[PDB]
Design an enzyme around this catalytic site. Structure first.
Site, short mmCIF file in Angstrom:
data_model
loop_
_atom_site.label_atom_id
_atom_site.label_comp_id
_atom_site.label_asym_id
_atom_site.label_seq_id
_atom_site.Cartn_x
_atom_site.Cartn_y
_atom_site.Cartn_z
CD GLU A 197 -1.02 -2.41 2.02
OE1 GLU A 197 -0.44 -2.18 3.12
OE2 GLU A 197 -0.97 -3.53 1.45
CG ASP A 209 11.64 -4.82 5.72
OD1 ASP A 209 11.04 -5.08 4.65
OD2 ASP A 209 11.14 -5.01 6.84
CG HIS A 282 12.99 7.68 2.83
ND1 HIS A 282 12.50 6.50 2.31
CD2 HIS A 282 12.72 7.64 4.16
CE1 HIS A 282 11.96 5.78 3.28
NE2 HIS A 282 12.07 6.45 4.41
#
Lengths: 306, 311
Positions: A197, A209, A282
């Site tokens: 999502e 991860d 990021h």
């Protein structure tokens, strides 16, 4: 793994538009899996082996980015973040859209004072994307409202480190693919590449991860995760007895097969987390050490193989 | 539309654990939307169309329920309400938990005096749930403290009416989904399926209008003698808000003209940021396990929204 990582990190796959990532995963896995399916939500599930124990390896395939929320009369785009994109990371950066369209991120403000004011509390409402359009109709044809964009940056080697966009979590996807490419499984092994999502019964689930590598200048925290320290095994607080046993199994595998590892410290199906230390998460230039990735592959092959 | 309403109302989604509802909405919308995303708050946003006017349709996906707060030595569960659940609606009722466990709600008191006393001043601390366990350890493994439960009641047709749990506000979610399935949009249409915030605590999309799809109490049951009463089969209820802005009143007037022009039944509901209006489905027995709607009201609401928003 270099070419596998290059393809996965450079593939276009923001939330909802991960078709290219799925195709690459299936192309890399052909001849190495027994089957696959893509559920209604877009999760890709693959499986191999026939052992009595069923183990899930899970990594998510979405990458962070932006979504177009408005177009003005001159064709400039207004955007909102998708995932943890900081507006400071977008200034002067180029954004890639699904059809190949490239856009330039600018900041509002004409005078040097207004710009200095905007950067001190930078907000997405002060940003716009310029895709070279001269009107709303031109921009709508190229990049309608609702369009997703990602970092327009690619894979590069930096003195033995790998740098790309979307290491989070395409490096986790790469680990699972490489495990399936090499393993002779003692379990029934499922690989779940989730949209984040599932429909698969299993006894264990291991999430692959990334975790922040805190080994850059002015990092003074002890027990920090670091590049070349090996896979980071995650300590959970509210973990069940069965979840803690998975973690202890992985520690025992690492020590017994002489694989470097580090412990990521506290701040239904039993589960553990194994993470690749990553710098600049990021950002358009997330960085990993390939020996950590290789150690993570080895760890999983020795835990699950025979 | 019957199967959509069945699947949405029967889905597990108490406030706090609405994942399964979000998945059903997305699966039903596959092929009928141009995109979707989940924001930080967990709101599901979908969109279709490219018109210059941007319109939001909004419905909340969480339902009322219970939460386990304790487990005693004999395996019995203590619960507290999630949302507006009356303890009187739980007496003798079955509760369904997230993992599928079914529990029975009982009330304390052995004497006929304290039972009558307890039931005349009924509180949640006089209730317990029996999940068939015989010890704390057994019950902890089946239904740990913190587990959520909902009514174990499902969808049923009652002489042309629809009855189920969680019509508030799964019938609003169903209206939006059905609009997206049918509509050729004249606007850029957003659907926002939101989670309600807990009372005492605390979208990303710019748009010109927002229309909330809610339920409103249908006051057409025996001895209900109040004017301004909404009724089943009277059509969508268009809310007349007291402090509405000029722009919000313009939307309401738009919907009235659309309804009058296309012969759509509707009723006006008067109480006793983005310009907004509210369109409500009349519903009997709100917050009970047997909330009741009239399918023609739901069809008329979908028809109204399509006429207003579609070309």
């Amino acid at each position: 793994m270099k070419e596998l990582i290059r393809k996965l990190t450079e593939a276009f796959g923001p939330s909802g538009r991960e078709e290219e990532v799925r195709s690459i995963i299936l192309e890399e896995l052909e001849g190495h899996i027994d089957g696959h399916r893509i559920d209604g939500l877009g999760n890709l599930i693959v499986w191999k082996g026939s052992g009595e124990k069923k183990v899930i390896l899970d990594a998510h395939i979405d990458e962070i980015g932006v979504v177009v929320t408005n177009v003005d009369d001159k064709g400039f785009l207004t955007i909102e973040p998708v995932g943890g994109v900081s507006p400071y990371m977008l200034l002067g950066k180029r954004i890639r859209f699904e059809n190949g369209t490239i856009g330039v991120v600018g900041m509002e403000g004409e005078t040097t004072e207004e710009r200095q004011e905007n950067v001190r509390k930078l907000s997405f409402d002060k940003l716009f994307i310029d895709i070279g359009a001269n009107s709303r109709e031109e921009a709508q044809k190229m990049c309608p409202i609702g369009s997703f964009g990602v970092y327009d940056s690619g894979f590069v080697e930096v003195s033995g480190k790998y740098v790309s966009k979307a290491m989070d979590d395409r490096i986790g996807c790469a680990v699972i693919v490489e495990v399936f490419k090499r393993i002779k499984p003692a379990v029934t092994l499922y690989g779940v590449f989730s949209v984040q999502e599932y429909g698969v019964p299993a006894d264990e689930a291991i999430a692959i991860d990334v975790t922040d590598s805190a080994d850059t200048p002015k990092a003074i925290k002890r027990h920090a995760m670091r590049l070349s320290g090996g896979p980071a095994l995650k300590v959970k607080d509210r973990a069940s007895i069965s979840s803690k046993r998975i973690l202890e199994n992985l520690i025992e595998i690492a020590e017994k097969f002489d694989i470097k590892y580090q412990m990521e410290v506290l701040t239904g199906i039993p589960s553990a987390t194994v993470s690749i230390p990553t710098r600049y998460v990021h950002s358009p230039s997330e960085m990993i050490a390939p020996d950590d990735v290789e150690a993570t592959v080895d760890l999983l092959i020795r835990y699950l193989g025979a």
